[PDB]
Ligand binder design. Structure first.
Ligand SMILES: CC(C)CCC[C@@H](C)[C@H]1CC[C@H]2[C@@H]3CC=C4C[C@@H](OC(=O)CCC(=O)O)CC[C@]4(C)[C@H]3CC[C@]12C
Ligand SMILES: CCCCCCCCC
Lengths: 74, 52, 60, 74, 40
């Protein structure tokens, strides 16, 4: 249960059965309940927004792995 | 006793397990050195891109 | 005026370089995970073979 | 060798003798080889970029301390 | 115009946030140096 705490999206990928089992059934079963210079600037700001959105997605998946390890621990 | 005629199976098993657990720690120090490694200190080779 | 736009360009280049360095560090972590798995399988087979051939089998 | 790994730029100053010894000679000797609303927005973006530049410089110095520790260790 | 106004407020909030973050980092480095002095 310590190994499933440190899984990241850059190494592993969450299977759909461990998606649907360790997040919905057992937490409700174990009482958890959860002009030219201006053009490059828009491209840079769009790249910054894409990078922050990807970072938030990876952080959400690693928090999901932490909660799965917590459920198996309980 | 300290009879050197034959060795017990349990003492042989203890020596066997001690040899392989010592080889396990000399492997785990190598994998800890491989893990904590950054591009500002080491260059990654070409044959490790295909094999490992 | 132009200095702010060049600064936004600098921020974008800095974030791209940090992303690429994190990619290299993830590769260094993954090769260690591979070495870890191959020695797990090797020592599991050696441990089962040793406890079979040296501990139970003559002693029966 | 563990004290010299955790030396930060804010609390220590890297002397020139460890610069000339443990950074150049020994990594080759040991085979290491390495408008008042508008105007403050521009000033804020300039401050953010200059602070990220300072952060990059301090990160380079602390990685240099880590490399000195690695050389002493080998 | 109403869409333009909130972006400048966002940039000013980011600047104030990073300035408060730098002040907190300076105070925690001060605590680390106090620990270093007591240890020596
Ligand atoms: C204790 C005596 C009887 C045997 C010692 C065996 C070692 C000399 C060999 C066997 C396995 C080898 C390891 C096998 C795998 C690796 C990963 C490889 O990458 C780097 C060498 C290393 C650490 C080897 C280091 C030297 C080891 C420990
Ligand atoms: C133009 C505003 C850019 C803000 C960058 C903040 C980066 C936080 C990691």
């Amino acid at each position: 249960v310590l190994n499933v705490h440190h899984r990241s999206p850059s190494t592993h990928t969450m299977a759909p059965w461990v998606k649907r089992c360790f997040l919905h059934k057992l937490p409700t079963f174990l009482f958890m309940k959860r002009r030219q210079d201006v053009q490059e600037a828009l491209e840079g700001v769009s790249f910054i927004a894409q990078h922050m959105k990807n970072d938030d997605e990876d952080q959400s998946v690693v928090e999901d792995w932490k909660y799965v390890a917590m459920v198996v621990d309980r | 006793p300290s009879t050197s005629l034959v060795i017990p199976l349990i003492g042989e098993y203890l020596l066997f397990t001690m040899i392989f657990v010592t080889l396990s720690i000399v492997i785990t120090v190598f994998v800890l050195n491989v893990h904590y490694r950054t591009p500002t200190t080491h260059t990654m080779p070409s044959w490790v891109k295909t094999v490992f | 005026i132009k200095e702010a736009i060049q600064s936004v360009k600098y921020i974008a280049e800095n974030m791209k370089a940090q992303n690429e360095a994190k990619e290299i560090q993830d590769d260094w972590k993954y090769v260690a995970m591979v070495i870890d798995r191959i020695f797990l399988w090797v020592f599991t087979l050696v441990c089962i073979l040793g406890t079979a051939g040296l501990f139970l089998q003559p002693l029966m």
